[PDB]
Amino acid sequence: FSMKIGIIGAMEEQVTLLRDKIENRQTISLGGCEIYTGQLNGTEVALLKSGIGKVAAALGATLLLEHCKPDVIINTGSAGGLAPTLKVGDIVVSDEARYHDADVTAFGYEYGQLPGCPAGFKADDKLIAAAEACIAELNLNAVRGLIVSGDAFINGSVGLAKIRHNFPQAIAVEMEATAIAHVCHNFNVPFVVVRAISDVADQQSHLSFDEFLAVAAKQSSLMVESLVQKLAHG
Amino acid sequence: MKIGIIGAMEEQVTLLRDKIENRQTISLGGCEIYTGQLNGTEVALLKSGIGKVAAALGATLLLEHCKPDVIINTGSAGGLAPTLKVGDIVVSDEARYHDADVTAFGYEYGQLPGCPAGFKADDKLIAAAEACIAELNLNAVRGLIVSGDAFINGSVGLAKIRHNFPQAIAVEMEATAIAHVCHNFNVPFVVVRAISDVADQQSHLSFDEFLAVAAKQSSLMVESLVQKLAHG
Numbered sequence: 326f327s328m329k330i331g332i333i334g335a336m337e338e339q340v341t342l343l344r345d346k347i348e349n350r351q352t353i354s355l356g357g358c359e360i361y362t363g364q365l366n367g368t369e370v371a372l373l374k375s376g377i378g379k380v381a382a383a384l385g386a387t388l389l390l391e392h393c394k395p396d397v398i399i400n401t402g403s404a405g406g407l408a409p410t411l412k413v414g415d416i417v418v419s420d421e422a423r424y425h426d427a428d429v430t431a432f433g434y435e436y437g438q439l440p441g442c443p444a445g446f447k448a449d450d451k452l453i454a455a456a457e458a459c460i461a462e463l464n465l466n467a468v469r470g471l472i473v474s475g476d477a478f479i480n481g482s483v484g485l486a487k488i489r490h491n492f493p494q495a496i497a498v499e500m501e502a503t504a505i506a507h508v509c510h511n512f513n514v515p516f517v518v519v520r521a522i523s524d525v526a527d528q529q530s531h532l533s534f535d536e537f538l539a540v541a542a543k544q545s546s547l548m549v550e551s552l553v554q555k556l557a558h559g
Numbered sequence: 560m561k562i563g564i565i566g567a568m569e570e571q572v573t574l575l576r577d578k579i580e581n582r583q584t585i586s587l588g589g590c591e592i593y594t595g596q597l598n599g600t601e602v603a604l605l606k607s608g609i610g611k612v613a614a615a616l617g618a619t620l621l622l623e624h625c626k627p628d629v630i631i632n633t634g635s636a637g638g639l640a641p642t643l644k645v646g647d648i649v650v651s652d653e654a655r656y657h658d659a660d661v662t663a664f665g666y667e668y669g670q671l672p673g674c675p676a677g678f679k680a681d682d683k684l685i686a687a688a689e690a691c692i693a694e695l696n697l698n699a700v701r702g703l704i705v706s707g708d709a710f711i712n713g714s715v716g717l718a719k720i721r722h723n724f725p726q727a728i729a730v731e732m733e734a735t736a737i738a739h740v741c742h743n744f745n746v747p748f749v750v751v752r753a754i755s756d757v758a759d760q761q762s763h764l765s766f767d768e769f770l771a772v773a774a775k776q777s778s779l780m781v782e783s784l785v786q787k788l789a790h791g
């Protein structure tokens with residue numbers, strides 16, 4: 326009864342459903358980001374709409390941490406599926422997060438790793454578990470694994486193949502997860518990514534994203550709502 | 560007036576950290592902020608770490624806490640403009656991401672949704688920097704600086720930047736992130752960095768050889784600029 330859960334989403338459509346569910350909501354506007362406070366099923370939450378990309382997410386994650394001091398962070402939104410058994414709508418939960426577009430290999434850093442940072446960032450084990458519990462209880466299809474981020478919308482061709490080559494175990498790709506993980510790592514705050522698949526990152530990813538965002542928002546949202554419930558009670 | 564200064568590597572901010580008097584260190588979000596005076600001018604120097612997220616994070620803490628009036632981003636860079644040479648100075652007219660790509664939806668290459676395609680550095684700050692470059696007889700170039708989370712070492716990487724930004728004068732890894740954050744906070748900025756390599760196949764070796772040189776030059780520039788900004 327005194328846990329505050331931070332939730333971060335990039336686009337308005339990706340956070341709109343959850344924003345409308347917040348009881349006693351209030352709006353805080355800062356650094357070009359918006360933070361909704363209130364409760365979601367009796368649980369105190371702080372929902373930030375960050376904007377797209379690594380820097381936007383970092384700026385927002387920093388404002389959320391520094392200002393709302395949430396206990397854990399859940400990054401939601403959509404993603405391009407890379408793992409074979411993923412279909413539009415299915416859930417992906419992060420085990421870990423890595424930048425697919427960071428490269429200081431010229432200095433002997435592991436591909437994806439930035440100097441001063443670990444090669445990848447680990448999601449909180451308990452958060453991952455509660456998320457798997459929800460996945461099982463809602464009976465949805467999900468895959469747990471490495472999620473990779475970059476400042477590009479993958480659309481097949483070279484972009485896609487480079488990622489597949491460098492991160493064969495990557496189960497999905499998007500644009501904010503690793504930045505949020507990087508910031509939480511610095512603030513020593515537990516995180517977990519729970520996203521719904523909107524496309525498969527090929528030549529059709531753009532059209533698929535357009536046709537299925539409502540579906541990904543709904544599916545990811547249901548999971549987040551359920552995860553907050555699960556986390557604060559069980 | 561308080562001038563905020565951001566640099567990535569310790570080696571890149573240590574000379575400046577040393578001259579700060581009435582010095583205090585604040586440790587937060589895994590970044591260090593050194594507040595005090597640099598030759599009579601109030602400053603806040605942040606060692607951010609390498610890359611866009613590291614810089615965005617550091618910049619946000621700096622702005623949201625020390626509330627500087629302007630931001631000076633320093634450090635080094637890979638020369639792209641034909642006349643640049645190790646030690647030379649590049650000044651930002653503007654900064655753009657060379658690795659952001661959401662063109663699949665119609666944004667300009669390098670542009671992220673919700674942001675202008677590029678971020679303009681402050682005219683006054685640019686003018687002051689040019690006056691210092693002139694007063695110190697330094698060889699410098701002004702123009703577009705492109706940032707990315709990759710160290711450029713010729714080959715395909717360099718080719719991609721030549722192709723999307725034939726006009727870029729230099730490449731590095733934090734500038735646009737800092738510009739982006741200053742944008743959201745309405746804080747003017749300017750980038751002043753020294754060339755440590757020319758981003759070719761030997762950039763790694765050259766970065767290694769001229770580490771110190773870069774640090775000294777960029778530092779000298781920053782001290783002069785701070786001074787000019789605060790006392791004419």
Ligand SMILES: CSC[C@H]1O[C@H](O)[C@H](O)[C@@H]1O
Nearest residue numbers: 335377402403499500501
């Ligand atoms: C419109 S670019 C794709 C967006 O959806 C996912 O959440 C990505 O991370 C990005 O925010």
Ligand SMILES: CSC[C@H]1O[C@H](O)[C@H](O)[C@@H]1O
Nearest residue numbers: 567609634635731732733
């Ligand atoms: C060690 S990778 C190159 C570094 O020097 C420049 O300042 C870049 O921005 C990065 O911080």
Ligand SMILES: Nc1ncnc2[nH]cnc12
Nearest residue numbers: 403404405478479499526
């Ligand atoms: N294909 C893709 N690339 C990047 N971010 C995405 N988010 C959802 N689909 C994506």
Ligand SMILES: Nc1ncnc2[nH]cnc12
Nearest residue numbers: 636637710711731732758
């Ligand atoms: N070649 C290069 N690429 C990226 N950042 C740099 N900083 C200095 N040289 C660089």
